Structures are given as structure tokens and as C-alpha cells.
Amino acid sequence: LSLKYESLDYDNSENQLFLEEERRINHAAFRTVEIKRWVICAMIGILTGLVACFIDIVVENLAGLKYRVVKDNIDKFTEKGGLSFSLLLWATLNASVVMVGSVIVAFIEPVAAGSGIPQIKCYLNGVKIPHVVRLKTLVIKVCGVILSVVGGLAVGKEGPMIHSGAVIAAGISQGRSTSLKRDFKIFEYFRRDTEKRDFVSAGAAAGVSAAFGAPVGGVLFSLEEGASFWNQFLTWRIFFASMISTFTLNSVLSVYHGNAWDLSSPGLINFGRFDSEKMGYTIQEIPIFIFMGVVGGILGALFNALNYWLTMFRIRYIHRPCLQVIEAMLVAAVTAAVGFVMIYCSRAFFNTPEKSVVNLFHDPPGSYNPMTLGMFTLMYFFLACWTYGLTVSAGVFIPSLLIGAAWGRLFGISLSYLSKGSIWADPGKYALMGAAAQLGGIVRMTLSLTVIMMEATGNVTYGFPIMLVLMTAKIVGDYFVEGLYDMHIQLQSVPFLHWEAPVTSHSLTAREVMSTPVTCLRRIERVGTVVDILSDTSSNHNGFPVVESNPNTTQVAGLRGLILRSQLIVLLKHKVFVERRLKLKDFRDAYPRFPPIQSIHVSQDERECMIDLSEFMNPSPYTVPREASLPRVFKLFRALGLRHLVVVNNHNEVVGMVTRKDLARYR
Amino acid sequence: LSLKYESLDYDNSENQLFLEEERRINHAAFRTVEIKRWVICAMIGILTGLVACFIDIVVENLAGLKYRVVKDNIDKFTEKGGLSFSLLLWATLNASVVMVGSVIVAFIEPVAAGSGIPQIKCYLNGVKIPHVVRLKTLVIKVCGVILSVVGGLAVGKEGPMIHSGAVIAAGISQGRSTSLKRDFKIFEYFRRDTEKRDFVSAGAAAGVSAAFGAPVGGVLFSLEEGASFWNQFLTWRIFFASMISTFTLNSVLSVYHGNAWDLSSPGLINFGRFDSEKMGYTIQEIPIFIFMGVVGGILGALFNALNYWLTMFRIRYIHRPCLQVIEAMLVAAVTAAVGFVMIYCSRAFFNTPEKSVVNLFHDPPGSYNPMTLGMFTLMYFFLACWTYGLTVSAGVFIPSLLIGAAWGRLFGISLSYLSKGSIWADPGKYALMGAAAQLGGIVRMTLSLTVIMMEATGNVTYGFPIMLVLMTAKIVGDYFVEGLYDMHIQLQSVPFLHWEAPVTSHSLTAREVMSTPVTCLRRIERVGTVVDILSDTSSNHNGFPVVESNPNTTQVAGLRGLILRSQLIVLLKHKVFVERRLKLKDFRDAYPRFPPIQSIHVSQDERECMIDLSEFMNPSPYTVPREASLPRVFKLFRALGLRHLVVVNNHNEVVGMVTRKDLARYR
Ligand SMILES: CCCCCCCCC(=O)OC[C@H](COP(=O)(O)O[C@@H]1[C@H](O)[C@H](OP(=O)(O)O)[C@@H](O)[C@H](O)[C@H]1O)OC(=O)CCCCCCCC
Ligand SMILES: CCCCCCCCC(=O)OC[C@H](COP(=O)(O)O[C@@H]1[C@H](O)[C@H](OP(=O)(O)O)[C@@H](O)[C@H](O)[C@H]1O)OC(=O)CCCCCCCC
Ligand SMILES: Nc1ncnc2c1ncn2[C@@H]1O[C@H](COP(=O)(O)OP(=O)(O)OP(=O)(O)O)[C@@H](O)[C@H]1O
């Protein structure tokens, strides 16, 4: 959709240098590479769990400090100023914390804004958003989520965990820090995009597991996002990482909050225990659940749609960082004022959202007055909608669950009245169902969310109902608007590939999808020609088919290989011309950041030399016939994580190039 | 490995007829095909659950009848004959039930022998074992498992559920019964191997879910076996089927055993509830668990190895059906005698294995004397080893879990003695760990088994230890011998593709793997030539590349398509010669069973005619370069479920053919 975004080189080039390295590795007499992958996955899990522990502990302590300071100060300030004076003071306190958070996000690292989940979804899809995996981004994300939660915004701390795990996985796998310019001479074999994308999948799964105490759910989330060929080894490693993440979080928290290692804190949010007779559903109740799904599908849409409009306003008028900070402060102040009006009219805004969700799930039937619960539902709905897109590190999972739990507990109260206090009409069960439905409507997650809800709930039997609502919420929701993360991905104009091609696509063939004419390089090519092709500012192609150079062959453009701009740049830098032989490490040294063609200097004498690309080109590029259905091209492209696909004639002559933007256009 | 086994045509041929059908389907103005897939998955789940209910209820009633008959008869027979007389009578009773079961297996349908899991694994791998999915096979399997369990063999009823679900999925999806020669004019679009293999995956997942009450575990089992490109839609449907299977089983059983629908019977085997303080592991205990894994890895090997030798004897000397029935009777009699000696020396053989496993898991610390528990462990180990390969419908999961639980509860008793009755040294927790370790050693299942154990246990926290043991059991076990299901697959000589190619395979290239010379067909081909190629009894190739026929092109064997023996047979039958136009249904009519080439009659005048294969050939065959690494060929072959892969020159001239046996040879 936009050229700002490049793509990962997931499909490794099995060139001659790579095969030489593999021969030496096999001769090594021991395959330590897999053991190193395992050690890296363990470290990823441990570090993600420790990040979750840090956030939880710091948030708890700072929230306690805010509560203590205001509890001490209210007497003094209300004695003379009055209630309104204390209202203003507390609102300014919240605004100040949110101000620091929004400053660090807008003025230092705007990528840190939000949960990070859309960015990680794009990364696992195969698109590289500029600063998603950086040390600065992780630091800003963690600090900002702490400051946002302490600042009393309608936000949650679960979402940033996925992004933090992804960044940790990308970082520690390399063995070196580009930001700190420190190289630890380890894990050099894993300085390639394939291994990095595997480790990031592990890290995202670990983040989900630490967030919700849902290991299998995290594994399934990573599998969904990747949408690749099945690798038993990688899935098992991801499972290992997720398990260690949840284990580390639980153990450390148990040692902290309690004085024993007994495991009672699987995740950052813990729903509770639902193993009771009152929380048992009958077949007669299955239709009822489905209906709530419809509701969650509609309300969710109304959420997303509203945000869309809000987002546009922010793109039009709140583009500036200073205005962004001011808007975040204003939202925080209005949230505080709504809370005060709430609290003084009633006789949860001060309390954590997770505790409110738990109480809604498990409190006895007569706990809540319907009127106040509905007021909270409406106000929190509109506040969460007005908070998602702010330049603050925050998530939307817990807010969505809270909204759903509230209106589900209202539905349960109404059912209990209508059914004369029946055991089957228990408000907490319907609160859980409503939480699932609202989260599904706002975010269209199906398998991973079902498994996550089952694990957090702790019951496997509740999965079948949770499934049916999550189904319906999607089916109804997709009727009106697209999902939140998708919506923001479209707005950012990222080239995003969906699970499958548009249904009416068997009509289309690669001939329509492919791009022509194609810029190709002869196997033995003049240095000047390569320099001119790469130096062109009209286009910034990063993959070039390598065609026959000998005059003997009949083929006009017979496909011999595919080479990349990065490899050509390395070769030109090292002046590897036919007129010290490179090793696969020499290419890995440039990684991740490759010098621009402008940097390389090629003298007119050197411009007349030649480059032989046979030793460095990918000898075997993936190829499709020109008369091939679009679904097949899409399936092959997505499954293998290809960056370039070559469309050829019957005679194996290059006729076109299919890339990510070629397949993303149709929708 | 052997030519007795063909392969599924999972990769659909997007020929002209298929595209015409898709255009008409799109013009239909409503896509009911997906809705029909959903309805079929729901029916699969319901029917699998009902099969599980039938087996459970019938087994319970018949076991009660046996217990009542013997309880009444022992007084009368022991009064005059003595204890030995009653011993003989009861042994003969068990032998008679096992005799009926073994007769129906050996003399009617030998495929029904065993769990069916190896056969379903092969089917999902892509190999077609002759009678795996047949009505007769399902009937025999269910009856035989009932008779084996009622006959007191060291067997379990869980394993046949996977096979039964697979057969149901294959059957009801077609809309017609070949065995009963009845056609219900429904589900005609799904009479192709792709849809059948998807439905069978759903059915296998449903079987696992009904067996262990583990929906997600069943989904993961199916995903592991398929090892294909990720399809969100298919995975979601499989999840739907598994959930409905467990729900139906639980609901029906609750209505039967209780008088209320309250859900308390998720699966055929139910471990129990482990949410207690005594069943809580510490970090200090993590190493201990690992050690037990090693034990489970070693013992499991000793199991498998022994069976191997036994299997050989049975292949050499107990090949005959009558001898097979006699051997099953002898094993049953020896099992009964061991039970009697057991029972009279002590003062579980009469009791169900599942109840014994549950009691071992949950009974209080002082329940079992170590001496008798060890005697049972050893005797049951050797009896289960001597029972797995019998011509009786049976499984090995529950026996393995029982063995592991027994020696794990011995390990826990020893730990309690050594640690002076510590709370951390609780025998039941170690019994669960030992069950997992022994099952892992005997069967090398890693992810699906971990998730299944977590769900059956009901605790997510126990997964991390259960993982570590299951890891170690595999790593140690693979050091000595291969897994049981694998071992039997090798012995049957089925061409089985593993998850990845041998590690030292980058050295090999398609040129080594591919088969030459290749038998190809010109696009316009003489009918006599096709008849001769298909009539050859030297080879039975089922896939033929279609090369250029026009003299104009330079290519000697330019690849234009791929056609199949079945399609050619249909065309010859309908005399579709250039010298009524077929519809995609006409090919589906022959499916599943295609007439042999011998059946078709072609007159000498017709032999001189021509066939144009363009409208029917697969216009776009998957292709790889001759200079391509074996890992890549293997990855593409396994991910896309290909039956044929064409290896071509730089000029796109056919040079070789890679099939399943080509890639399975290297090991
Ligand atoms: C108690 C909390 C635990 C905190 C853990 C923090 C670790 C994760 C982290 O916060 O990051 C680590 C930074 C890397 O950050 P980094 O700024 O250098 O980012 C580059 C680069 O910038 C690319 O960015 P780009 O693609 O945009 O060009 C990007 O892709 C690429 O993945 C990155 O390596 O240090 C390290 O490596 C860690 C040293 C590992 C060696 C010891 C192993 C034992 C564990
Ligand atoms: C309460 C217990 C529930 C019992 C359910 C039993 C249903 C499953 C079953 O036991 O099987 C059904 C048989 C098919 O057995 P079948 O012998 O004809 O086998 C052929 C053939 O033989 C191929 O065998 P092959 O490949 O070796 O040549 C094989 O692949 C291919 O899948 C098979 O269709 O009847 C049916 O279709 C069911 C009618 C469905 C229409 C109503 C839909 C509403 C539910
Ligand atoms: N060698 C080539 N010859 C002609 N067109 C090309 C070539 N490579 C890419 N294109 C086309 O140019 C357009 C822009 O491509 P771009 O330069 O972004 O490729 P890229 O950056 O390598 O792709 P990605 O960033 O997704 O890996 C695409 O629509 C693509 O079809």
C-alpha cells in the first residue's frame, strides 16, 4: 500500500556460501545450533516474565503512593478550598502523570504509542515497520504503560507485553546491541531475518502467556499471525518459551506478594476460579449466549466506527506532538472528572480495571444496582473509545472486557428478574460471556482468544459457549465494520496480506497480478549497470531476477537466479569483481542496516569491470506460471514467507514479478 | 517403501472444468459451501461423541453382567470343583469374549486390529492404507473394543475413538454409502480428496477430544499429523468439531448416569481434580521431574524393543488367522491367571484401568504397599507389551498411563520416606508425572500430549513440568529405539514422510532424488499411446507430465501440465476424442474407485484417434529446479500435500519426477 514499509527476507538464499557454511557446521561434530535456539527461547521467556513482574510491582507501588498522597491531602485541601478545589488538584495530578507519559511517547518515540499488537501482527505477517523492535521503543513502552495506568486512563497493561516480548526476542537473539554499540561475540549464526522472525514469534507468544497466563493461547496467536508452513520444532520452542514466561511471572510474584513459591499468579490479569454449580450452562442457555454475541458484535462495531472518525480528526488537527500531549492531558482530566461525578453521585475509577472485572465476574447476585452499572458501562465505553488512539502506551483488551462484563452482568440481572431468581440465571456467568462478546466485537480474534479465555477462566467446558459468542460477534461485526487492529493497519497504509485471497479471485491470474516490465541482471554484469540500476531514484526495487548472460541460449531472459540489493551492495563494497573471498559472515556484518548505494564509490575504471553473481545469487527462485490462479500465488507467497515471486513463460523466461503489494492490492 | 500404498490427491487440479464450476458457484448468488462444511463438522462431532457414549454405556453394562454372573456362580462352582475349577471357568469366560472379538477382527477385517492411530497418522500424512475408512472397519472396531475391554485384556478404549471419528468424517461428508450402495443426493461438491482429508482431520480431533476431554489437544494432534500450510478456517472448523464432540459426550453421559444435564464427564477417561496444595510443585522439584523423564524414556524403550521382537515372531509364526485367535485367547487366559494369583496372594485386574489410574493419582499417601504396587507394575508392563500387537481392537494409552502412574507412585513413596513425609513429596503428583513420562517413552508425542494432559488434569500450571518430562522421555527414548506407532509404520513398509528431511541433506539435490527417465504424454496424444502407457504392468504410475506436442517449439519436453491416470481413464471411458462435453461431476462419479485400464475397451479404429489433454490437465504443475536442495523439495512437498513434483531444466524441460517414495527413502 505504501513504500515506506519494506519486507523481511524470511526465505533464506541457499547460495554457495550458505552451503559451504552448512558443510562446515555439519563437520563441526556437534549441532549446538538447536541447543542455542533452546537457550535463547528460555532467556526470552524469563525476561518477558521479569518485564511483567516489573510493571506489576511498580504500578502497584505507585498507585499506592497516589492513593496515600491524596488520602492525606484531601483533608487539608477540602477544608479551605472545598470539594471542587480537591477535584481540580486530583485531576491535575492524573494529568501530570499522563503528561510525562505522553511526552516520552510523542517527543522521543512515537512508535511506542498503543499496545504494539498491530505492529507485531505486521512484523509476523512479514512487513517491517520502522522502529518496532528497538531498545528505546521497549523502554518508552514500559515507562509509558506504567505512567498511563498510574495516571488513571481507561487503559490496560496487558497489550504492551506482546510488543515487549517481541523486542526482547529480537534483541537477545542477535548477541549484540546496535543502540549501545556493544557486540557480545555470541549468536552470530542467528543474524538473519528467518531466525529473527522465529524468535519474535516465540516472544509474542511469551508476552501473551505472561499477560493472561495462557501458554497455548499464545502459541496459537503466534501461529495465526505467521500463517506459515507447519514446523513442529519451532512450535515446540514457542510452547517452551510461553510456559517459562508464565512460570517465571508466577514464581517471582509469589515470592514477592507472598513469602512462598506456591503458584497463584499465572498472569497480569487473573479472572479467578469459575468451578461452581452456579457457573454451569445448559443447552437451553446456548441460544441465549448466541444472542449476546450479536449484541457484542453490534456494540463493538459502534466502538470501532467511532474511533475511526476520531482517528481522522487526530490525523487532521492533532498531528502535532504538543497538541497530542495536550489532548492526552485533557482526556485524563475528563476521565478524572467523570470519576468524581460518579463517586459523589453514587453515595471503580480509582480501582484497577482488572479487579473490577473480577468482581463483576464473581460477586454475589445482589451486588450491583442496575442503574449505576449501566451508567458506568456507557461512560466507560465512550471514555475507552476516546482513549485508544492517544499518544500513550496502552491496551484495549482489559477495557473491552470490562465493558462486556458490565453489560453482561446487566443482562444477567434482567434474566434473573424475568426467570424469578433461577440458578441458571447467574449474573457472573453472563458477565464472562459478555466480556468475551465485547472483546470479540472490538477485536476479531477467534481461536487464540477462545483458548486464552478458557485458560484464564480455568475451565475447558466453558470454551464451547465462549466459542459461539466469539463466532457471532465476528460474523455480525464484520457485517458493519472491520476490526480495530485491522482498521489501524489500513489507516497506516501498511501492505498487509490476509489469510486468503478475495473469494472471487480464481478469475484473476498471475498475468494480472504480476508487474511488468521487469528489471533483471545478467549473471555476468557490468559494474556500471548494477550501479545504475541500484542508483535509480525512480524505483527502489530490492530484488532482481538474474537471467542468462551467455549468447548461446535461445532464451531471451532465461531465469537463472534471484539476487538482492543488499547482496549487490556488499559485493560492490568489497569490490568482488572478476577483473580474499567473501564468507556468509561478511554479509551478516552489514545486517541489519545495509549502506545505501550512494555510499559505495565505483571509479570509472571499476565501472567497466564485471560481477559474476552465480556464487551469490539464489540459484533456485520460487516461480509460478503466468497462467496460474491468484489463490495459488497467494497461498505459496504466504505459506513460504516469500518476498519476491517470479512469473515466467513456458520457456522459463522472466515475464513478471509478484510481491507483497501485488497481492495486497486486491480487496 | 512399498507399492501397495497409493497417495491422496490433496492438491486440487485447477483445470478448465474446475474453473467453470467455480464461476457457476460464484454466480449461484450465495456461498452455501462453507455453511455445508460447518454443518458436516457439527455432525461429525455429534456422531463421534455418540459413539463414545455407546462404547462407555455398553462396556459398563456388560462388565456389570460379567461381575454379577461370576459373583453368583463362584459359590456353586467353588463348593464342589474348588478354587482351581473357578479359576479355569473365569479364564474361559474371558477367553470366550476375547475369542469372539479376535474372530471378528482376523476373519472379517484385519485392519480393525489395533487402535487405528498409526493408520490415521498415515492417512493425514497423505498415504492411503487400503480399508482404513470403511463402514465394516468402524463396526468391527467398536464391537471389538467392547469385547476386548469386557474380556479383561490389558487394553484401553480411548485409541479406537480417533479411528472411529476419522471414518465417520470420511463417510458422512460424501453424502453416499458405497458399502450400502445408497446415494443421498447431498454433499456432492465434497467428493474429492482435499475435502475428505480436511474432514478426517476434524474427525480425528473430535475423537481425541471425546477420548480425553481435550479439544485443543485434538486440534493440535491434527495439526501435527497434517504438517501443512496454515488454514485459519480449517483449524477453526476442527476446533468447532472437537468442542461439539466433548460437549455431546458430556451431556449425554450426564443425562444417562445422572438425571441432570450438569457437565461432569468431559471424556471417556477423566483423571480428576488436582487443584490442591499437596499437588503443587516447587523449583527444587523441577530437576526431580526431569530424572523421571529419563526413567520413562528408558522403560518405554524397553517396551518398544520387546514388542518389536514379539511382532517379528507374530509375522513369522502367527501369520494365520486361526493361530491369531488362539494367541489372543492364550493371552487373555494368562492375564486372567495372573489376576487370580495377584488377588489371592495380596490378601485392579477386575477393575477398569482408568479407575486404577485415578485412584493412583488421588488416593491418600498411605494407600498402597510398595511391594504389591511394584509387582503389579512389572506384571502389567509385560502383559501390556504382550497384548499391543494382538489381532484385537485395543489401545496402548491407558495401559501406558497405568504403568507410569504405578512406578511414579513408587517413586513418590520412596521420596516421602527419604524426605520424612514432606508435603512436597506427595505420591499422587509423582504418579501423574510418571504416567506422562511412560506414555512419552512408549509414544513420542510432545505438543498434543502436553496439551491433552493439561486439559485432562484441568490445571495449566502443571503443563510446564509435564512438558519437561515429555521432552526428556523423547530425547532419551529416541536414543535407544523409535516410537511404537513409527515402529509399526516401518514394519508395514508404508511410505511415511517425517516432519523434515534428514539433517545432512543440504548435500543432496533434486537430481539425486528425482526419478529418470520420465514417462510423459503429448498434449495431443494418440489414444493407442495412452492405452499402452496405462496398460503397462511393469509400472503403475498414476501421474504423467504433459509436454509440448507442437513441432514449432525448441523445447524437447517442455512442461505444459500434469494429468492423472484416473482422469485419463474417465476420458477414455467417455471416448472424449478430437476425432456431450464432460463436467467436473463426471470425474467425481468414478471417485473414490476408478475402473482399471483393463476395463476400458478401445477399438483399433479408436486407437488411431487423438486426445487433447489441455482442457483436463493441470495447467500449472508445481515444479522445482534440478539444482535444488533436498530440504526445500521436502518442505514444498509436505506443506502443499503434493503427490507429484516435476524437476525441470533451465529451459523448463521435464528431467525428473519426485514423489513420496523418493523423499521417504533417505533416512
Ligand atoms: C529485567 C528486564 C529485562 C530487559 C531485557 C532487554 C533485552 C531486549 C532489548 O531491549 O534489546 C536488547 C538490545 C538490542 O536493542 P537494539 O537497539 O540494539 O536493536 C537492534 C537493532 O537496532 C535492530 O533495529 P533495526 O532493525 O530497526 O535496525 C533490531 O532489529 C535488532 O533486533 C536489535 O538487535 O541489546 C541487545 O542486543 C541485548 C544483548 C544480548 C546479548 C546477551 C545475551 C544474554 C541474554
Ligand atoms: C450413533 C453412531 C453413529 C454412527 C455413524 C456412522 C457414519 C460413518 C460410517 O460408518 O460410514 C458411513 C457410510 C460410508 O461407509 P462406506 O462403506 O460406504 O465407505 C465409503 C467408501 O467405501 C470409501 O472407501 P474406499 O476409499 O476404500 O474405497 C471411503 O473412502 C469413503 O469415505 C466412504 O464414503 O455411509 C455413509 O456414507 C453415511 C451417509 C451420509 C449421508 C447422511 C448425512 C447426514 C449425517
Ligand atoms: N525487479 C523488478 N522489476 C519490475 N518491477 C518490480 C521489481 N521488483 C519489484 N517490482 C514492483 O515494483 C513495485 C514496488 O516494489 P518495491 O520496490 O517496493 O519492491 P521491494 O521493496 O523489494 O518489496 P518489499 O519491500 O515488499 O520486499 C511492486 O509493485 C513490485 O511489483
Ligand SMILES: Nc1ncnc2c1ncn2[C@@H]1O[C@H](COP(=O)(O)OP(=O)(O)OP(=O)(O)O)[C@@H](O)[C@H]1O
Ligand atoms: N511419470 C513417471 N515417470 C517416471 N517415473 C515415475 C513417474 N511417476 C512416478 N515415477 C516413479 O516411479 C516410482 C513408483 O511410482 P508410483 O507408480 O508408485 O507413483 P504413484 O503411485 O503415482 O505415487 P503415489 O502412489 O505415492 O501417489 C517412484 O519412485 C517414482 O519416482
Ligand SMILES: [Cl-]
Ligand atoms: Cl500500537
Ligand SMILES: [Cl-]
Ligand atoms: Cl490491555
Ligand SMILES: [Cl-]
Ligand atoms: Cl490492546
Ligand SMILES: [Cl-]
Ligand atoms: Cl491400528
Ligand SMILES: [Cl-]
Ligand atoms: Cl487407549
Ligand SMILES: [Cl-]
Ligand atoms: Cl493407542
Ligand SMILES: [Mg+2]
Ligand atoms: Mg520496498
Ligand SMILES: [Mg+2]
Ligand atoms: Mg502407487
